[PDB]
Design a protein around this ligand. Structure first.
Ligand code: HEM
Ligand code: HEM
Ligand code: HEM
Ligand code: HEM
Lengths: 144, 140, 138, 143
């Protein structure tokens, strides 16, 4: 991330309602890519789309994923260390394939686009595609 | 393959697109080039600046091909048989690139149709944009 | 799958013959060692070398592939039962099917070196990809 | 690890990079035809026999496995051994890093075909670690 790109992403992140966007992103990931429900079968009823999007534990875990995202937004020059602990949890303990990190990062982008519309310009999206790429890679660091 | 409910969500979503198909298809390309610059190497002959007449025109061709696919959901291999030969044999497009264009299309549609871009429609359009990709990556 | 692809698959599976279950067990043992994350789908299995559960499951996997070879024109119909199992019930991550198909190709090349031509290699990769797409469908 | 390193290095002394290289690159161009896009100057790639008998493919494949043999002697510094090659494949050739994994997987298949029972599952698992590291070191410039 360049200084100008970093300044644009941080300013836009100030508008993001993390609680709504986080629950919607994790919910959409469970609906569009249903094999991810395997890791959240403890959350209860995921049998239909409306159940997933209104599941209270999915909205709660999504805020946690986007807070972790927000914590990474403060350390754009050290993603590998900010997520080093989380990378080992998802790898050695949760066994989440690293392909799903980019899948969730891409769903988040779609969620940001739906939630902000015309203000989510292609230039801004490209900057956010850099961040989700770096976050997904930092989470996959303890696999390699 | 797409279910009956999948096909209905695709037909409904593309209906709300309407006369903005060519306009959304150009934006999806511009989003793909900006987010994934490796995809530019497939268009070295194109002017890729913002607002380019080439990018605008090709997006209309892409949108028209998607429109033909939505209207022929029961026979995607037949409706896109000519495009499958062009992409796999003539152009030899890396299949990972279709995932980038599909994602760019989903971002474009979600940005322009927020109230209609439900999780159910999101799941259907992703399943749809993946079938088109498989058809065009067939004949490999 | 083209007519030439189907012809290569039926020919290659004929050379396998009565060694299908034996090869299917090895391909599993190669998967579990090369890609240890695949082990998380078999927590009830003992996955050590020579395990009867790995041997048994490799036979069921090879039997499913033989059913798919004999029904190449209707893979969704021949594997609709297993597609429901791997998608709804097991929710297997699609990346894992690429790992098994690779492990199968390594096993087949190891035992059928003279028949594992590049044309057959390409056909078997396309068959195993279609079989996976069917199991990941729905 | 050290015991994995010793087994992988000992097995590599038996590999004839000459043939295994030309077969691994040819099989990549046949099994994954979109990679022919990067080798169109090599000439006739229209058929399987043309790819396998193409002299430039056999010649290039030897260089790829030589580069592989060079990474073999630097298993604790793959990122620095392939730093120049990473810049070439990422900044100049624009090869998607997914293809590095494809070539590494085809190489394993080629080793399994050429060595049979000697390419044990335990030995294959160790070699999968190498081709994963080589592919990651070659994709370093993208990140
Ligand atoms: C950018 C991507 C991701 C980030 C930033 C992230 C972050 C986190 C964080 C902070 C936690 C801690 C939760 C807590 O302590 O309460 C967590 C737990 C977890 N993550 Fe993720 N994660 C990501 C991707 C994924 C994906 C793609 C999956 C599965 C497909 C996944 C599966 C899980 C599971 C199963 C847990 C534990 C659930 C529980 O505690 O009950 N994560 N993750
Ligand atoms: C749903 C996905 C896609 C659709 C519907 C589509 C459709 C089309 C159409 C309609 C054309 C013009 C054919 C003609 O003029 O006769 C075309 C050409 C082309 N496509 Fe795509 N395509 C898709 C994906 C891709 C991707 C992902 C890439 C590269 C990353 C790509 C690269 C090209 C190139 C380089 C051309 C040549 C254009 C020219 O020379 O003017 N296509 N495609
Ligand atoms: C071509 C690919 C595959 C084929 C043909 C296949 C076939 C089968 C068959 C025949 C069964 C037994 C069904 C029964 O006994 O009722 C089964 C079960 C199972 N499969 Fe697969 N499978 C494939 C891929 C995978 C992959 C990639 C995974 C995980 C990484 C997987 C995980 C499982 C599990 C956990 C079971 C349950 C077995 C048990 O609980 O005893 N499968 N599969
Ligand atoms: C995965 C391990 C790989 C290794 C170790 C490797 C190694 C090499 C080496 C040593 C060269 C010679 C560079 C020079 O002569 O200056 C080269 C060139 C090249 N590589 Fe690779 N490579 C790998 C993968 C790939 C893949 C997957 C592709 C394409 C899909 C590719 C495409 C090329 C091309 C197009 C050239 C230049 C050929 C020419 O000059 O005509 N490489 N590579």
């Amino acid at each position: 991330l360049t200084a100008e790109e970093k300044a644009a992403v941080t300013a836009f992140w100030g508008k993001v309602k993390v609680d709504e966007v986080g629950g919607e992103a994790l919910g959409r990931l469970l609906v569009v890519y249903p094999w991810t429900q395997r890791f959240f079968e403890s959350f209860g009823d995921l049998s239909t789309a409306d159940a997933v999007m209104n599941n209270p534990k999915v909205k709660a875990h999504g805020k946690k994923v986007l807070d972790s995202f927000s914590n990474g937004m403060k350390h754009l020059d050290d993603l590998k260390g900010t997520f080093a602990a989380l990378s080992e949890l998802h790898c050695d303990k949760l066994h989440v394939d690293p392909e799903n990190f980019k899948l969730l990062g891409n769903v988040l982008v779609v969620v940001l686009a739906r939630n902000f519309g015309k203000e989510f310009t292609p230039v801004l999206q490209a900057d956010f595609q850099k961040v989700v790429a770096g976050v997904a890679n930092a989470l996959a660091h303890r696999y390699h | 393959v797409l279910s009956a409910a999948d096909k209905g969500n695709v037909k409904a979503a593309w209906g709300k697109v309407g006369g903005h198909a060519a306009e959304y298809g150009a934006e999806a390309l511009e989003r793909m080039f900006l987010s994934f610059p490796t995809t530019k190497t497939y268009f070295p002959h194109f002017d890729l600046s913002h607002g380019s007449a080439q990018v605008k025109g090709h997006g209309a061709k892409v949108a028209a091909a998607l429109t033909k696919a939505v209207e022929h959901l029961d026979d995607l291999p037949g409706a896109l048989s000519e495009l499958s030969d062009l992409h796999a044999h003539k152009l030899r497009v890396d299949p990972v690139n279709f995932k980038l264009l599909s994602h760019s299309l989903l971002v474009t549609l979600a940005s322009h149709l927020p109230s209609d871009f439900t999780p159910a429609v999101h799941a259907s359009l992703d399943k749809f944009l993946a079938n088109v990709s498989t058809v065009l990556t067939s004949k490999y």
